[PDB]
Amino acid sequence: RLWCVQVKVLRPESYWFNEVGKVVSVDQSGIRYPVVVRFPTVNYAGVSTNNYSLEEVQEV
Amino acid sequence: PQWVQDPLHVRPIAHAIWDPHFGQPAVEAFTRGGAQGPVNIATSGVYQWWYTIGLRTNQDLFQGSVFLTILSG
Amino acid sequence: SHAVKIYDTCIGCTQCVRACPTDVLEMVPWDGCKASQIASAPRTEDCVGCKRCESACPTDFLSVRVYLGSETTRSMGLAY
Amino acid sequence: MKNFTTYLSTAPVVALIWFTFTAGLLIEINRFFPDPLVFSF
Amino acid sequence: WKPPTLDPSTPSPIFGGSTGGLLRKAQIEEFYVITWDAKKEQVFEMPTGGAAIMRSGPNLLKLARKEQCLALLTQLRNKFKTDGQIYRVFPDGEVQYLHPKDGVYPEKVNAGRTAVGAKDRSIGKNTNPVAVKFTGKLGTYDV
Amino acid sequence: MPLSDSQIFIALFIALLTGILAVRLGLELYS
Amino acid sequence: WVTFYFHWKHLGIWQGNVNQFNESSTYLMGWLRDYLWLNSSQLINGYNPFGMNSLSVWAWMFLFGHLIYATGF
Amino acid sequence: SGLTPCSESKGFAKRQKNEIKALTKRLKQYEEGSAPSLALKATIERTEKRFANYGNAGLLCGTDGLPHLISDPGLALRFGHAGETLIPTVGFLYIAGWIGTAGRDYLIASKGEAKPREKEYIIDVPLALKISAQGAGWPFRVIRELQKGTLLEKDSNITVSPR
Amino acid sequence: KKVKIVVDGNPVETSFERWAKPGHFSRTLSKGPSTTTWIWNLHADAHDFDSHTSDLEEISRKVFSAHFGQLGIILIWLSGMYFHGARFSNYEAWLSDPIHIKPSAQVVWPVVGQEILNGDVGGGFQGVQITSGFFQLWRASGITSELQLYSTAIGGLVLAAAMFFAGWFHYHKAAPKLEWFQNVESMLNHHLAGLLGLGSLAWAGHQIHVSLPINKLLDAGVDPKEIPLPHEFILNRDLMAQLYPSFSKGLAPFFTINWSEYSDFLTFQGGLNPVTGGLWLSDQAHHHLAIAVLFLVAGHQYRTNWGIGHSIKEILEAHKGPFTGEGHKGLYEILTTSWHAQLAINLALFGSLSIIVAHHMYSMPPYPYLATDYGTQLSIFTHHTWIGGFCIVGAGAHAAIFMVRDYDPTNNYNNLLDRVIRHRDAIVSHLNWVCIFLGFHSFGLYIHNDTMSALGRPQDMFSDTAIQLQPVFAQWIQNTHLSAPQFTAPNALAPTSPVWGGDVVAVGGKVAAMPITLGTADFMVHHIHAFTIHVTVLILLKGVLYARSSRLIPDKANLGFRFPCDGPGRGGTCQVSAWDHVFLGLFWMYNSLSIAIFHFSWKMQSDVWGTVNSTGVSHITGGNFSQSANTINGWLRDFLWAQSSQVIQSYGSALSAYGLIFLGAHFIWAFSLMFLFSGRGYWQELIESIVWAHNKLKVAPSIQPRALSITQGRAVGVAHYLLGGIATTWSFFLARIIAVG
Ligand SMILES: CC1=C(C/C=C(\C)CCC[C@H](C)CCC[C@H](C)CCCC(C)C)C(=O)c2ccccc2C1=O
Ligand code: SF4
Numbered sequence A: 001r002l003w004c005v006q007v008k009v010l011r012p013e014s015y016w017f018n019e020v021g022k023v024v025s026v027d028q029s030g031i032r033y034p035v036v037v038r039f040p041t042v043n044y045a046g047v048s049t050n051n052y053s054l055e056e057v058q059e060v
Numbered sequence B: 001p002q003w004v005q006d007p008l009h010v011r012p013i014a015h016a017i018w019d020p021h022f023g024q025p026a027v028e029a030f031t032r033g034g035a036q037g038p039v040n041i042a043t044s045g046v047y048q049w050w051y052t053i054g055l056r057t058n059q060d061l062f063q064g065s066v067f068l069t070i071l072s073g
Numbered sequence C: 001s002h003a004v005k006i007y008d009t010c011i012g013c014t015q016c017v018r019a020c021p022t023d024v025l026e027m028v029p030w031d032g033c034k035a036s037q038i039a040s041a042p043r044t045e046d047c048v049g050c051k052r053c054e055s056a057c058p059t060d061f062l063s064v065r066v067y068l069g070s071e072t073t074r075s076m077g078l079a080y
Numbered sequence D: 001m002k003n004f005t006t007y008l009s010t011a012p013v014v015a016l017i018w019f020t021f022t023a024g025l026l027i028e029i030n031r032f033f034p035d036p037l038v039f040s041f
Numbered sequence E: 001w002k003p004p005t006l007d008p009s010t011p012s013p014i015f016g017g018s019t020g021g022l023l024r025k026a027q028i029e030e031f032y033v034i035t036w037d038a039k040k041e042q043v044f045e046m047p048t049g050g051a052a053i054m055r056s057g058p059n060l061l062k063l064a065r066k067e068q069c070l071a072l073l074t075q076l077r078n079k080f081k082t083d084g085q086i087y088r089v090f091p092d093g094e095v096q097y098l099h100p101k102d103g104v105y106p107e108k109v110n111a112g113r114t115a116v117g118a119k120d121r122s123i124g125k126n127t128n129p130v131a132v133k134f135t136g137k138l139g140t141y142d143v
Numbered sequence F: 001m002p003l004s005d006s007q008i009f010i011a012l013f014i015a016l017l018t019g020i021l022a023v024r025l026g027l028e029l030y031s
Numbered sequence G: 001w002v003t004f005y006f007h008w009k010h011l012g013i014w015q016g017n018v019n020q021f022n023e024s025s026t027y028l029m030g031w032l033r034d035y036l037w038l039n040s041s042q043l044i045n046g047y048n049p050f051g052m053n054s055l056s057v058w059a060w061m062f063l064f065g066h067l068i069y070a071t072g073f
Numbered sequence H: 001s002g003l004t005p006c007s008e009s010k011g012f013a014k015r016q017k018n019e020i021k022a023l024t025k026r027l028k029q030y031e032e033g034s035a036p037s038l039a040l041k042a043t044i045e046r047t048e049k050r051f052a053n054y055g056n057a058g059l060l061c062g063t064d065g066l067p068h069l070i071s072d073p074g075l076a077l078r079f080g081h082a083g084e085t086l087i088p089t090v091g092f093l094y095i096a097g098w099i100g101t102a103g104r105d106y107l108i109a110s111k112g113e114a115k116p117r118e119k120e121y122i123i124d125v126p127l128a129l130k131i132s133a134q135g136a137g138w139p140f141r142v143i144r145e146l147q148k149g150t151l152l153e154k155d156s157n158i159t160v161s162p163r
Numbered sequence I: 001k002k003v004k005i006v007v008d009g010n011p012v013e014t015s016f017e018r019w020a021k022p023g024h025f026s027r028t029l030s031k032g033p034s035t036t037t038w039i040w041n042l043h044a045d046a047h048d049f050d051s052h053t054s055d056l057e058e059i060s061r062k063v064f065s066a067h068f069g070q071l072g073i074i075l076i077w078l079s080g081m082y083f084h085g086a087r088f089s090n091y092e093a094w095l096s097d098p099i100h101i102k103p104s105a106q107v108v109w110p111v112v113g114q115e116i117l118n119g120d121v122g123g124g125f126q127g128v129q130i131t132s133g134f135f136q137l138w139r140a141s142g143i144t145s146e147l148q149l150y151s152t153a154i155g156g157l158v159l160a161a162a163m164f165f166a167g168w169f170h171y172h173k174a175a176p177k178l179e180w181f182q183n184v185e186s187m188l189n190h191h192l193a194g195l196l197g198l199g200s201l202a203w204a205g206h207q208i209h210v211s212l213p214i215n216k217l218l219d220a221g222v223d224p225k226e227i228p229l230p231h232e233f234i235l236n237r238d239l240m241a242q243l244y245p246s247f248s249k250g251l252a253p254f255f256t257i258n259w260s261e262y263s264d265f266l267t268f269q270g271g272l273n274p275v276t277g278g279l280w281l282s283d284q285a286h287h288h289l290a291i292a293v294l295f296l297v298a299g300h301q302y303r304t305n306w307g308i309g310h311s312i313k314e315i316l317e318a319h320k321g322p323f324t325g326e327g328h329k330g331l332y333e334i335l336t337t338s339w340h341a342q343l344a345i346n347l348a349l350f351g352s353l354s355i356i357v358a359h360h361m362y363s364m365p366p367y368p369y370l371a372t373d374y375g376t377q378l379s380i381f382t383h384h385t386w387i388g389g390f391c392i393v394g395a396g397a398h399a400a401i402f403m404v405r406d407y408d409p410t411n412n413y414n415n416l417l418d419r420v421i422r423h424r425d426a427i428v429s430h431l432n433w434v435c436i437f438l439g440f441h442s443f444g445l446y447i448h449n450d451t452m453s454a455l456g457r458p459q460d461m462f463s464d465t466a467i468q469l470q471p472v473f474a475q476w477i478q479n480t481h482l483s484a485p486q487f488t489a490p491n492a493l494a495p496t497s498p499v500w501g502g503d504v505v506a507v508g509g510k511v512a513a514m515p516i517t518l519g520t521a522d523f524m525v526h527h528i529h530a531f532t533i534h535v536t537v538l539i540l541l542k543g544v545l546y547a548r549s550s551r552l553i554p555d556k557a558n559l560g561f562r563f564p565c566d567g568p569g570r571g572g573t574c575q576v577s578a579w580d581h582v583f584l585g586l587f588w589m590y591n592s593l594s595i596a597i598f599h600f601s602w603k604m605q606s607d608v609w610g611t612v613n614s615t616g617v618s619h620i621t622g623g624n625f626s627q628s629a630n631t632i633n634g635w636l637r638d639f640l641w642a643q644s645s646q647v648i649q650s651y652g653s654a655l656s657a658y659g660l661i662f663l664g665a666h667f668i669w670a671f672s673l674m675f676l677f678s679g680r681g682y683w684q685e686l687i688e689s690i691v692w693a694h695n696k697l698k699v700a701p702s703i704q705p706r707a708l709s710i711t712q713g714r715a716v717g718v719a720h721y722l723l724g725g726i727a728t729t730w731s732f733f734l735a736r737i738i739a740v741g
């Protein structure tokens, strides 16, 4: 929820499930997936960022 | 019955061959010096099984075949 | 025809619409993402099933999904 | 010289040097001790 | 905005013909027509193979598939900066206007469009296939 | 001892009855 | 692999030459030469320019299976 | 297993005699002191030494006259065949644990750098040589990490697919 | 306008900075890896210069310096071949006895028992028998000592270092500009008159002054140590005139146009030297002199700087007709701006040339004692056939690359290229019908024969003793070429080859060459060749013609030359790219050339090669080609099963390496099928499980492991398939022909 805070992804279909990423930004306009997370590894599409909801990320 | 008499020196026959594409050497080669015409030598081992379970004649095998056709129906 | 569904993880980047070779997809107004737009698939009868849209989608997992279904002349890409 | 030694540190060059050393060690062991089948002396 | 009508008297590009054009499907099932207004006379690549010369002003090309028309329109928009319109023509003479459907290109968000195929969940929230057995549905994405 | 022609005809008739029953089952399974 | 093992070990046992399997199955060239190459001599001579015999149907099916196998590729 | 020692096996001696005979048959076409003659004589000497060493090692020979290895640690220890499989097993396991521990230590050291992927294809050769030399004492460190619980990543920190 | 030297001074700094940065040449790859795909992408894109930059000048400079590097590598390889002949060979002993001594120039070290490969090749020497034919080539050149082979090895390494210097120099110091490379008229003039013409003239000079007298003394029976050195023939004109009396007249007959005085060493004999079984060296000297004059004339065609000459653009633009639209207009701009179109043309012609070379070298053997060295003959035929087929497939590949990348419809309106694209459906459909017809009426003849033979009806077969298919056109051509010295070439003493007819040329009791009669089996196998070549052409031409678009994918050019598919839609679009057409054409070229080399091996073993005794000629397989090559079973038994006995019983001999390579190549071919039959999704999921195991023990790499890409999976599969099959045939051929030859 903070800036540049380690979070653990709880989305099961995510490539980075049970992995730790860095929060880039949290949108405050009430969108469905406001937490932007940067990961040190790429997924199968070569993407390093994904958007998650509040319940899908756990601060670590 | 011929296999029953001599089980160690008779090749068991699967079925007869009727192929109009056969040449004459093909007819004589698949006859194997017998009188039943061109035949296929069985590899399934049904002769040994049927002999072991007590079948002896062609009549017994024919009766079993008729009974199994009735069972299938 | 193939079934194309859009899930609410769409960020409205319009890449799937630009990737589509048969004009199946379009962006409609929305409020669930920052870009204020979501992809929609009103013309799935023209979908060939190439899955260029899924290749273009940046979300993880995909926001646009193509499920291959019953095949027609348009979905088989036949010019004859 | 730093760039040249960095090139020598790349994975295929390091693999070539290491496998040359290992293959040479095995070859010279089998030359000095021909036909080793069992651990017996 | 209103959907444009197809003018069948529109001149065709200068083309010597090819073996890659229309087939029996055009006469009995459907075919497609792309129209565009060229700024100048220039050579473009046919989607069915070969080079054609588009005439200055309006142009009309009949193509077997919608994908061929959209590939040609992508070439026209990217290379010649020319917009175009794509129609579907049926053997009875009925003409269905296709692209751009509301006059705005689909990549640009336009008001008055309604989302179809939208699911109000992430893709991992789809149910199990055992839950849609003997229901007649296409799959877990259909519920 | 070889079979007789009448035995082969009897077997063929029984197999024809079995084939009729097979066609009946195939039609019932189809609809 | 299983049926190759069964057939070669039993072929050596049936021919009275147990040492053929024992001295040639330890290396793969032994398998190739002393099982596939050696035992295909009668099969591929089922028909030749000099004539045919009763193994000609098996030679034809041998080539038939090679052709069907290749078509699948 | 019904085998006989190779030092008293007739097939073993027959094989040595046949191999020496074939090499000597090849030897008689060359003049004495020439390079092929010297090479064939060296091969003959190596053949004799190899057959003598295999006989002296206590190897068991089958009916084919060839040495057969014993790999059960019981039969190897109580009948003097531990140099065939058991001692090679210990040696291989030591070297394999050495290689694996050196690789693991290099990967863990490279994980802490600013560009962890850079060290995987441009090798830190001094670091790799230092870590490689430290792999001799791998069983002590590995067993300690196993007892401490630091050898294994926790299941909560490892990605899995949906079930 | 003006042909001149134009370079740029010091364009690229010579430094090791980019050596330390893999992927530096590529914009995408320079950022470093994230996954293991970057490792393969770096090697796959390393030589695609046109992908690195769009500047044609930089591409041309890279191509020029890479060609210098290739020439340096080739010279290193050649110098090593000459050095191994000088140091590790039995070449001098073979010179003293070329019939009973097998050539060998590879010696193995005694370790792990591998010294058994040093076989008793003869000459008091042990080593690996070689089949490259270097000994016969060196003997034909007049080389009589290891010192002369040492000199060529040292001189080759000096020239190799000069080539590597020139590649560094012409890229880093003085790189020519684009207008220098586009002087195709000057390049053609220099490469015809100066490369080929002066090369042929210089080699005619070597043949006349060195090769002719030394080989004349060798065939006269003189010991090689007693033969004078070549410079003795250069300096002493009387020693030359002792063998060729026209040398006493000097150069006066040449300048007074009394050319017929030189008839003793400039001949038109034809046929083979009966002593050596090779072509007459005087014939070859006259051949190379005539070729030199022809190429020196040919190199004065194109206009460069002195008004006279042809402009290639004018010739191309003037050659148009009523059926062909604008004709050859725009081809000059294609062939001066696209390296890929030039590579396609040159690869096609070079590969065809290699195959023609294989046929002409077997039929008219140009080296002494080459023809009776059956291992060398089989090896060089098979080798040059394979090189030709690979180059032709590459021609198809780079034609497709031109079509995807360098084709411009604006510059090609109603020319030949445009009109070919505009009827590609007709071309492909007609070629498809031709391939189906050829497959039916060639392979079905074999199937008919196999069925007839298996049904006990040999009288219903397609054979010489049955329903006959006589190749009457080829028989007429053979009869015409046999009768050529009578009427249509009266100044030729003999036909060009003994294969047309006539007598048997025997050297040392073995057949050098003999008539090759053609019957029903030859007819059937020649139509098999036609069918397989037509199918390979169909695949490669379909790839070229549909590289940019098709009815399935109208924007295929936007997807590139090399892409896996366009998804499972439209029914499924796997392998639509032109690259995948190259991928399938590799298999079909392998099939075609495998049948070609099998036909060569069986036909020469059955009807040409053998021992000439007092009664006649006893061939290696005793003439069983005409009896059994008309069935698939005949091929499988009498060629494959019978002739592989040498490679499967080669264990324990010097040929045991061929048995090991036979097994390993079967393995490699089988190993290829896992890449070809499978797909990368399975392997990626299996890698996910393995990565989990590595993550558990904290040994997961930072460079993330990925399965190979779909295109890489296909490339690996076809590469291992080709390697396994070709090396299987290689070991089988070499073991068979060394043991029985
Ligand atoms: C087997 C297989 C794989 C799996 C193969 C892979 C991943 C290639 C593995 C190659 C090497 C062995 C991986 C490791 C390379 C390292 C550079 C080696 C380091 C080890 C040291 C000893 C040097 C595919 O990915 C694939 C993809 C598409 C179609 C078919 C297939 C296919 O058949
Ligand atoms: S699968 Fe292809 S045609 Fe269908 S919506 Fe996606 S991109 Fe468009």
Ligand code: SF4
Pocket (backbone or CB within 6 Å): C006, C009, C010, C011, C012, C013, C014, C015, C016, C017, C038, C039, C053, C056, C057, C058, C059, C063, C064
């Ligand atoms: S590509 Fe994906 S995220 Fe972007 S608009 Fe389309 S569905 Fe939404």
Ligand code: SF4
Pocket (backbone or CB within 6 Å): I564, I565, I566, I567, I568, I569, I572, I573, I574, I575, I679, I710
């Ligand atoms: S199977 Fe592979 S190649 Fe074929 S369409 Fe699917 S992804 Fe593409």
